Amino acid sequence: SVFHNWLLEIACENYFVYIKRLSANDTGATGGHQVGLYIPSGIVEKLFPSINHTRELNPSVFLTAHVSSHDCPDSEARAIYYNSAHFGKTRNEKRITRWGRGSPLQDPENTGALTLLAFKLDEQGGDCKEVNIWVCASTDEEDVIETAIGEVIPGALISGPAGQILGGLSLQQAPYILPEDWHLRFPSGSEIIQYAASHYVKNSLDPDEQLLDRRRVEYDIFLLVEELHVLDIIRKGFGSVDEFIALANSVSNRRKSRAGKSLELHLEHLFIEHGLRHFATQAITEGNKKPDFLFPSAGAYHDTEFPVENLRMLAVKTTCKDRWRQILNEADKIHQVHLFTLQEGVSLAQYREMRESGVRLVVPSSLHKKYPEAVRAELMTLGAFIAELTGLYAD
């Protein structure tokens, strides 16, 4: 239980933690020369203040990178500010690179992996000189941390003091007219989603774009609805510490449960809204598998008269890394299965494994740029997947 102990160590020491899932580009999976692990600009001024300027092209500094997740020698990694936008070119991003040969952070097969970089604050206002990292090597490890703090979505850039980041509940509340009744009752996930779609996006008739915009709106109104209801109880206080913790746990489970059901609820709504009215979500196939989405219906799937080559299923895996093979056993009849994912890319080798198993990836349009070229070319946008189905069942 090394990871567990590592988490306990970090959570109570002076560390500034940054959590993210490795993108195809982070690992060099998108090909070419390694550019490094992306770091949020809003974190550079705190950790590497000396490279946060445009006086010279590509300023950088070194820091010792200790990897606790894999048996790797410590190395002098390089935090760097790709500055060329201020020197006649185009770059404008900060990254940490040169992890050393064989390092998990430079391994394309770790694309999609949940990674935690615990930076040691410099007691002098200077640049951070050491980072302790953990690249989750399996789903078992990821379950350890995500069970407590929640699942980390691809693209998420989480950072803050270790204690608050690893505590269980996530801080941060910044960004509407909520219906009267929401001030009295706590709306369901579907209700929030139907309100987000029906009341705020509408600036895009494209499914891929609608999904991303509505996901952003859902996040904000849930936060507002949550704030209303929680602020009320919270203001009255509690009789004991454990009545206090019990509520925190209640609040935490609600967020986790809703975060987990969100994506599938949005897709269900979009399929309906775009004319694709032929599909089952609570549909059993063989034994007790039940794929996330089955087209055109549970009935047609079990129908001896209905053509098999016209059946389709769509498994939804926010993060598909090591969480996709369990889909090949969900529909005996369907040999070409579709997988919807929000992952910021997959390696060529990962994709080859998928291709060989008859898996076809459906990815939100704007996320395609995150995939290696060879893989990108075979991706399906959400809009195209909907179109393909909205034709096969035209009758």
The answer to whether 215 and 366 have CB atoms below 8 angstroms apart is no
Which residues of this chain interact with a copy of itself, rule CB under 8 A?
1, 3-4, 7-8, 11-12, 139-140, 142-150, 160-161, 163-173, 226-227, 230-231, 234-242, 244-254, 256-257, 260, 323
Shortest Cβ 334–a copy of itself spacing (Å): 22
Shortest Cβ 2–a copy of itself spacing (Å): 9
In the bound state with a copy of itself, the residue whose beta carbon lies nearer, of 87 and 176, is 176
In the bound state with a copy of itself, the residue whose beta carbon lies nearer, of 58 and 147, is 147
The residue annotated as part of the active site, out of 81, 301, 351, 371, is 301
In the bound state with a copy of itself, the residue whose beta carbon lies nearer, of 255 and 274, is 255
- Cβ neighbours for 259, distance < 8 A, ≥ 6 positions apart: 150, 151, 153
Shortest Cβ 224–a copy of itself spacing (Å): 11
Angle of helix 207-236 versus helix 189-199 axis, rounded to 10:
130
In the bound state with a copy of itself, the residue whose beta carbon lies nearer, of 3 and 82, is 3
Shortest Cβ 190–a copy of itself spacing (Å): 14
Has 301 been annotated as catalytic? Answer: yes
How far from 196 is each of 131, 179, 228, CA to CA, in Å? 40, 12, 17
C-alpha–C-alpha distance, residues 325 and 193, integer Å: 30
Shortest Cβ 152–a copy of itself spacing (Å): 13
In the bound state with a copy of itself, the residue whose beta carbon lies nearer, of 325 and 335, is 325
Handedness of CA 197, 201, 204, 209 (dihedral sign): negative
Contacts 24+ apart (CB under 8 A), 211-219: 211/266, 211/267, 211/270, 211/364, 211/382, 212/364, 212/366, 214/266, 215/262, 215/263, 215/266, 218/192, 218/193, 218/262, 218/266
As given in the structure block, the two tokens for residue 350 are 């990962």
C-alpha–C-alpha distance, residues 183 and 171, integer Å: 22
Shortest Cβ 256–a copy of itself spacing (Å): 6
C-alpha–C-alpha distance, residues 321 and 68, integer Å: 21
In the bound state with a copy of itself, the residue whose beta carbon lies nearer, of 184 and 231, is 231
Chain centroid, CA 19 distance in Å = 11
C-alpha–C-alpha distance, residues 327 and 363, integer Å: 17
Catalytic residues: 301
